[PDB]
Amino acid sequence: PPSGYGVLLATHDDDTVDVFTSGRKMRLTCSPNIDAASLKKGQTVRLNEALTVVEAGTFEAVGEISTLREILADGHRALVVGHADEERVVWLADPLIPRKLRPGDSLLVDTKAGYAFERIPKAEVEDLVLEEVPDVSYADIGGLSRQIEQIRDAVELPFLHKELYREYSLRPPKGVLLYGPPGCGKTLIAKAVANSLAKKMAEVRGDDAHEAKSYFLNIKGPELLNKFVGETERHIRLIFQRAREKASEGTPVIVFFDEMDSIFRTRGTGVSSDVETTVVPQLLSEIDGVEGLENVIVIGASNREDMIDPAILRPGRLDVKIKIERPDAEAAQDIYSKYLTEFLPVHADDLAEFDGDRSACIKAMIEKVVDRMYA
Amino acid sequence: PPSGYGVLLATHDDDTVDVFTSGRKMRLTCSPNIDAASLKKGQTVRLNEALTVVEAGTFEAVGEISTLREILADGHRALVVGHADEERVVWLADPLIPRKLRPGDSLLVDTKAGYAFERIPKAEVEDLVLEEVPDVSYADIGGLSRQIEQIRDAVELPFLHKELYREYSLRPPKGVLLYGPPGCGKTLIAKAVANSLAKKMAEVRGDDAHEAKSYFLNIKGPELLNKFVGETERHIRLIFQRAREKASEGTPVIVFFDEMDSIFRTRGTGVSSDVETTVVPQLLSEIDGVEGLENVIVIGASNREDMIDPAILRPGRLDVKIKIERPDAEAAQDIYSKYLTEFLPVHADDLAEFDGDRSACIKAMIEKVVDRMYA
Amino acid sequence: EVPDVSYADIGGLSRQIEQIRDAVELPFLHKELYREYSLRPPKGVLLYGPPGCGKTLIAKAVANSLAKKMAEVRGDDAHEAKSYFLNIKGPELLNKFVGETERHIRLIFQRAREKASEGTPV
Amino acid sequence: EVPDVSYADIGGLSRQIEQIRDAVELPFLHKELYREYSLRPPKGVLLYGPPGCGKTLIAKAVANSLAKKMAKSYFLNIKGPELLNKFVGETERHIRLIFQRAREKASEGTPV
């Protein structure tokens, strides 16, 4: 009953297998029950005091993680650099030999065994910001109809009809800007497009919430700003790389930058610090460069349109500049209707004149109040 | 009976379990006297000379503390860093699957077995935010009855009456701005609110001592200013994350931004300094962002109300604006009554005119002094 | 990955493309004639102008032309016929450590000198 | 740092000595009588006037006299231009550290 464990290394025609066990490299025969043909490199296997492979298992899930350097010519090996700049050539297991393994990846490796298993990003931090998706939708936003139409055309429309766009040789917009006076409702649209995207992703592929949320990234502002030189730029590089994996020409990845003025400037307006002077060219290269993002939409929101650098506010980077204006009388009526719902309790005195009709009473109250305030 | 110890890893339907023992992983059977189903992942279990589990214990060990970076998608493993910048993936223990686990929290981990047994909360502690409970109470403030009632309705009333607001579907205010001339009293009301919150969390709820200290997160303006790029941003994010994690349903967490005028100021004002284009957007996005606060009230006191930026003064961030005014004659009489108490030693010749009646004597002195200053 | 932009996809600039095409190809198109006049090929080309005027467009066209040329001359399309174009983002070479970025500079230029030949531009 | 200047060294400013005594010296002599009477002791003294007249001498003499009267008192002398740095926030953090040390010393109850 007490049985050991080991890591598979390679297979031979002798029906024998190389296994790393107890910190040493050994060769074993397999049990008649197990078929050595189905084994794959890097699989975990179970052993015994007689030193026989009895059962195969799933790959290792814990251990040291190292940054991938390059993939060797043979394709079964790759160079990985450890935490203290130690470099080692390690075999690539079956799962890596899915998405193509590319350098700049943090592969989970067992240095003594010399095998890489999987890799994980750290940009999740941003994906961790929107832990709960807002429940607001376009039905809960009033006073803006043309803007909602434009924002739907920018995002939803290209993906609803891909074949029509292909026939007309038109690609989805690369970027969207939202600008207007404070409080006019920019964050509402920004947090409602996220809800719509989550609903779409859930209904199309799978009901899992995490994967649905994994397509909207919330920068939240100066979160990218860091202490050390050349670290925030690498953070932006990682953000955009993680964005480019998740795009499949049928799935949009929305990277929302809030308060554009925080990290974006003219490169000359900076007085105390000019970190933006380094940050801006990196992101400009990421958006449009030698290699461009095929199906990534960057939605930007700001309160001061002029402070933003002219390079970003260029067609082909921020194609549609949606402007939200201060509400008029009809927009005020719509906003009031969105809040003064019929289900709100109302006094019997107000109900007396309109024979208890809640809807008409509340409606007339809405015009009365908007008329009072718009005088 | 000399008996060993090991760390449980996973359970199987064969009633046999994998245990890390003597630095290597063992598949071992369980004794009939211990239930295998009752076991939990990452459990310290007893062994013997025949390598059979005989007892199960607490998840107590001595281990290095690793700063938690992110939890994996599968929800069972998390990435952590080390003192030497060593990043490793570790399975979560049963208690860590409790308060929600967040990045930046220390975890006790045994790197050989790779399990995070528990989280150490004292390591991430902020004593700069904590404030000593003031002796000042509501009865100690005079001449500001309207402002006291307004701040009561803003802060204390919503949590006292929750079902009543839910019936009307009203959310608690998400910000209070005390503002006015110098000295007229702004810090005094903050002290009174802190004392009331301390009492409410002390005797009404009865959690423990120092729990009242935890709430009313108090930070002065200049304290947030730091020497690096994007270091104040980290402090803002940390304090708001602490406020978010401490606040529960019906539990108020109040952050006092004393001296709101000097801190933040107005963006684009001040040639000498440019801290404004970095700090003001972090606060603008933490409050009323894509993900909003639940039961957090931000109280800001300013002697220069107009100096503060308008984007953080518009409704939705600082809704309830309370203005402190200069005392009038009746207000001055009340303030004198708040200090000219009857416990002060009164001269006998002073009491001669009223036959030793100290209450009437002191009231008359207050009237005389008020008349003298207001003549 | 090699972009598909070619010279036929650029319009309104028939003079600048001529200059860059000459500076890239002619020293290698006619090496014997260049050595006849002892003319050293230029080693610095700068493209400057207002935003969104075609600078990256010309860069992509040049990269595509070089990749096609090297695919014609030899093989190993996997990395060869493309390794000769090195795309570097602006802040990409910036590094946290004190001397690592300088080492990156020296090492990049060292490889660019190694891979280069009299017939193969880098 | 132990101040050594005494009131005897100061000449011609005895009246200033008697005002400065009534704000720091007297309160800690019989503080019990004040908390009985509920008086709030003073908090800050600003010595202002033409320079080179012995402003520092008055403060050092007061500190030395208070130390001699106590039967443990702690005194901090920090010059102005030291609290100045071009980087953002450093001058404030120095003040925070100074006052943190002040609270550390005052926590026992000895005069600071």
Binding site: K227, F228, V229 | V229, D274 | - | -
Partner: peptide
Amino acid sequence: GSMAQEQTKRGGGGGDD
């Protein structure tokens, strides 16, 4: 005399065992 923030550059450290 405008005040300015700074960005520091780390120096790698070597530790064995």
